[PDB]
């Protein structure tokens, strides 16, 4: 018909992109980082344990002050802990017990939840009365919500299982922009440090970078074999690490449209559940399904330490804004903080 | 540190109050059974209780049945959430499209071998049983056509027939049950079990069957905790 060409021409565009992409690759970080000494042995110990949840904990996030963090479990409770004192501050009940994502506003005034109910709930913590109450209930998606992130106290970027991410305005309560283009479910999304662009992984072995200001798609990085479970930008904002269900994490640099390193080991056989860089970006923590999360080296690709402690698969992995501590949550209803 | 003593102490009253509420509602959380209800499609899953919740109660026991009819077809991602559910209710329509039975069998196998829905039992409802009581008598889509092994199948000796039911029907329905039992017993059965049933025209019996199977699952889990079976 009149579309066969589309393929022929689209496939030759892809071939040209790969060919031009190949000409850029002439070296790898493995040789460049040989001169720099390896990180060495890292012995992280659980400083705190937060045993307050009933069911498995499936999401978590850190506050901008790196002191109190919210966690979501499928028991229908959203708990705002206090890492320093391990004292709960707010135990918000939820309507839908099947929560899959959570977020804490940068200003610390609002919290975000969402899950299989295809609805993103936004709760206000600084209410005049003094009790946490529902503030907004965004509902414009068809599939489930996998991850939501606050840009400010007015707009929020939410991924969905319908293969479309959305930019919602809390003040109005409707989608401002829709970042369509993905084929499979969108599992995780990360915002850039400057809150101008963000990346999102999907269940088609593809990570797409968008621009909230413009609302279009600018790059598409491929190279994983299966669906991507989590991603996050490098602290500098010019690179991001994505872990897949192939027990492999990869680092991509947006400026060169390509992958830079792969952290794969023979012993590890299960997919990655979460990934997060350190404050300086040297380390790359990544949760696994082996009930333990490894501490990879961003330039050596060698396990510089393994953080076990959990007896079930780890679902959330966060690093404080100042990098002092690291929080890990698992399907065992426990949060461990590793300083 | 004068203000520290009278501020941090006030920060423990809130913690104690939250602990009290969590302890209070843990009871209600642990005593209510949760049940996922999924089906291939056009099976009539609304006939059990009668888009996301259906709370019911039998013999002073609460059941929360969670439907998932407002999602898309790719269950390989959002199905991992229902791993702690007590039992996954799977309603298969025994009735274009294709060998809907083959698709149901494939979905059941995938659920049985998911590596996450491993400790979760599966109640199975072969719905539209009476619906195929006429197809076999006609032969529009006779089972042997879509299942060569059916042409040599023998009805089980212990298979209780429905009073006044064409053997052919009884035979086809027991053959399907088998396809499912073989699929379920091919893998390890030491951590979860499959409970097959035939849906009837009355809903007062389906709820009782679900309650009985949930009690059986709880008892088996308790026995396994003590290493008795």
């Amino acid at each position: 018909s009149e579309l066969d060409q589309l393929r022929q021409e689209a496939e030759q565009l892809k071939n040209q992109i790969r060919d031009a992409r190949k000409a850029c690759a002439d070296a790898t970080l493995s040789q460049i980082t040989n001169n720099i000494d390896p990180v060495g042995r890292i012995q992280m110990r659980t400083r705190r344990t937060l045993r307050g949840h009933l069911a498995k904990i499936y999401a978590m996030h850190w506050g901008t002050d790196s002191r109190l963090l919210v966690s979501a479990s499928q028991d229908g409770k959203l708990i705002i802990w206090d890492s320093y004192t391990t004292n709960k501050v707010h135990a918000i009940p939820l309507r839908s017990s099947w929560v899959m994502t959570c977020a804490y506003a940068p200003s610390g005034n609002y919290v975000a939840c969402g899950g299989l109910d295809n609805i993103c709930s936004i709760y206000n913590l600084k209410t005049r009365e003094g009790n946490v109450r529902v503030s907004r209930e965004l509902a414009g998606h068809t599939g489930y919500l996998s991850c939501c992130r606050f840009l400010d106290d007015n707009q929020i970027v939410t991924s969905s299982g319908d293969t479309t991410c959305a930019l919602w305005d809390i003040e109005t309560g409707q989608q401002t922009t829709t970042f369509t283009g993905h084929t499979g479910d969108v599992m995780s999304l990360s915002l850039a440090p400057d809150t101008r662009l963000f990346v999102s992984g999907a269940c088609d072995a593809s990570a797409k970078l968008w621009d909230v200001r413009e609302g279009m798609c600018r790059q598409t990085f491929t190279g994983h074999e299966s669906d991507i479970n989590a991603i996050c930008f490098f602290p500098n904002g010019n690179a991001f690490a994505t872990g897949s269900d192939d027990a492999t994490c990869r680092l991509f640099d947006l400026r060169a449209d390509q992958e830079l390193m792969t952290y794969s080991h023979d012993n590890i056989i299960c997919g990655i559940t979460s990934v997060s860089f350190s404050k300086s970006g040297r380390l790359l923590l990544a949760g696994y399904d082996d009930f333990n999360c490894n501490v990879w080296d961003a330039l050596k690709a060698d396990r510089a330490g393994v953080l076990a402690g959990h007896d079930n698969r780890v679902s959330c992995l966060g690093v404080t804004d100042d990098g002092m501590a690291v929080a890990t949550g698992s399907w065992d209803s426990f949060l461990k903080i590793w300083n | 540190t004068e203000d520290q003593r009278n501020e941090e102490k006030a920060q423990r009253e809130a913690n104690k109050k939250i602990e009290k509420q969590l302890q209070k509602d843990k009871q209600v959380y642990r005593a209510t059974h949760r049940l996922l209800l999924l089906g291939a499609g056009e099976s009539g899953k609304n006939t059990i209780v009668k888009i996301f919740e259906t709370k019911f109660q039998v013999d002073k026991v609460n059941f929360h049945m969670f439907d998932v009819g407002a999602q898309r077809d790719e269950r390989r991602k959002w199905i991992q959430c229902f791993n702690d559910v007590t039992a996954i209710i799977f309603v298969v329509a025994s009735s274009n499209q294709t060998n809907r039975l083959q698709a149901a069998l494939k979905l059941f196998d995938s659920i049985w071998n998911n590596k996450w829905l491993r400790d979760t039992s599966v109640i199975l409802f072969l719905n539209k049983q009476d619906l195929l009581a006429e197809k076999v008598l006609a032969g529009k889509s006779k089972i042997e056509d879509y299942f060569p092994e059916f042409a040599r199948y023998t009805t089980p000796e212990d298979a209780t027939p429905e009073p006044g039911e064409d053997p052919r029907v009884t035979r086809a329905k027991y053959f399907i049950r088998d396809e499912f039992l073989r699929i379920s017993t091919a893998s390890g059965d030491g951590r979860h079990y499959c409970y097959p049933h035939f849906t009837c025209a009355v809903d007062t019996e389906n709820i009782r069957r679900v309650f009985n199977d949930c009690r059986d699952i709880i008892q088996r889990m308790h026995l396994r905790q003590y290493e008795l079976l």
């Epitope: 088609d204 074999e225 299966s226 192939d246 997919g271 | 790719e74 390989r76 049985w112 590596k115 893998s187």
Partner: nanobody, 128 residues
């Protein structure tokens, strides 16, 4: 980039034989269980066959049981389906699918158009 191409197939008469090939480039072929489904004109996707990573565990749909053979060549990273004794109701598009997760004994691939890890497919028909 996961890429699943299909070679072979096309048109035939009642009872012919074609060796359809599925070539994979972008994943470790040996670590994935690979299925192969068919979609008739006017109907949805129906699973038609599968094969394990090693090639031992083989499953067949009842409709074409005993008329089709399926195998995998890990060394050549290919999946070979020998189709025989064709039948009039075998006219459809055959899609080579790959199970989504490595080292898994179950997968969910007969979904709608929305399935990234499936080949573009080929339309093969059989008539007079």
């Amino acid at each position: 980039q996961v890429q699943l191409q299909e070679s072979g197939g096309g048109l035939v008469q009642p009872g012919g034989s074609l060796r359809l090939s599925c070539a994979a480039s972008g994943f470790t072929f040996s670590n994935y269980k690979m299925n192969w489904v068919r979609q008739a004109p006017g109907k949805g996707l129906e699973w038609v066959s599968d094969i394990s990573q090693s090639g031992a565990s083989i499953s067949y749909t009842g409709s074409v049981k005993g008329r089709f053979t399926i195998s995998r060549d890990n060394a050549k990273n290919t999946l070979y389906l020998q189709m025989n004794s064709l039948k009039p109701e075998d006219t459809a598009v055959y899609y080579c699918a790959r199970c989504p997760a490595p080292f898994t004994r179950d997968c969910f691939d007969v979904t709608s158009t929305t399935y990234a890890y499936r080949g573009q497919g080929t339309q093969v028909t059989v008539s007079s």
